[PDB]
Design a protein around this ligand. Structure first.
Ligand SMILES: COC(=O)c1cc(S(N)(=O)=O)c(SC2CCCCC2)cc1Cl
Ligand SMILES: [Zn+2]
Length: 257
């Protein structure tokens, strides 16, 4: 029963998940002037050469490209991380209009959408155990702006009409997430949480500075998805983003400048 509407949206989540008002919630606004360059941070290692996408899916909140995470194929390491984090799935957050949609903001700027590639720390064995640890998950976040198309996104947009509705999936083998990355791996990082219930405070966030471009047609296909199942009053899947939360006692670190 939680979602993105007036009566079940982000302002209400704390009734079922009191950690919504915790000390390390996400997303946040990234004030770029205040983030400090940390010369001790390592370049991100994004090793996606052997990624096995299995499936794409309409979870009723967003859609997700899943991966086989039963072996170290697609992994994230370095940057702020200790150890190895296996890619589980990616999904997006986006707006009803191009001036909203991202979860993180940059100097209060909202982007049209935000891609999250979710990884879990292999030291904990499985994602359910990683959710219970302060360093269980690492989420790589990538902003999307509307301008030219992103050719590596097209295979995802073209299947969305087959998952219009919540609980639909389809094969999605051989999708290469390297196609969704911007040129630069410069990033901000801070300790936070899931941005959806249960809002567990288990995430090291790594937010890339460089957005990717997607076309207006591509994002229009995201906005044709539905939050409902096959069979209820139709409500378009838009504005499935949590606003920025209090930074509290946290420092955002920059990998550059
Ligand atoms: C609209 O947002 C979502 O649909 C969503 C958003 C998140 S986020 N923003 O990463 O907190 C997760 S993370 C989830 C992935 C499966 C393993 C446990 C954590 C999964 C989902 Cl499925
Ligand atoms: Zn997300």
């Amino acid at each position: 029963h939680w979602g993105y509407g007036k009566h079940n949206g982000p302002e209400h989540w704390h009734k079922d998940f009191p950690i919504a008002k915790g000390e390390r919630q996400s997303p946040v606004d990234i004030d770029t002037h205040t983030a400090k360059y940390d010369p001790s941070l390592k370049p991100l290692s994004v090793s996606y050469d052997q990624a096995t996408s299995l499936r794409i899916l309409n979870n009723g909140h967003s859609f997700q490209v899943e991966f086989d995470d039963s072996q170290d194929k697609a992994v994230l390491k370095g940057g702020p991380l200790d150890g190895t984090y296996r890619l589980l799935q990616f999904h997006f957050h986006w707006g009803s209009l191009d001036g909203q949609g991202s979860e993180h903001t940059v100097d209060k700027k909202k982007y049209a959408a935000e891609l999250h590639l979710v990884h879990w720390n292999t030291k904990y064995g499985d994602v359910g155990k990683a959710l219970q640890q302060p360093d269980g998950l690492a989420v790589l976040g990538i902003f999307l702006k509307v301008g030219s198309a992103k050719p590596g996104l097209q295979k995802v947009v073209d299947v969305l009409d087959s998952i219009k509705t919540k609980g639909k999936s389809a094969d999605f083998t051989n999708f290469d997430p390297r196609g969704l990355l911007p040129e630069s791996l410069d990033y901000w990082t801070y300790p936070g949480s899931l941005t959806t219930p249960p809002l567990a405070e288990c995430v090291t966030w790594i937010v890339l500075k460089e957005p990717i471009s997607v076309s207006s047609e591509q994002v229009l296909k995201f906005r044709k998805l539905n939050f409902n199942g096959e069979g209820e009053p139709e409500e378009l899947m838009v504005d499935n983003w949590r606003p920025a939360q209090p930074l509290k006692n946290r420092q955002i670190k920059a990998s550059f400048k």
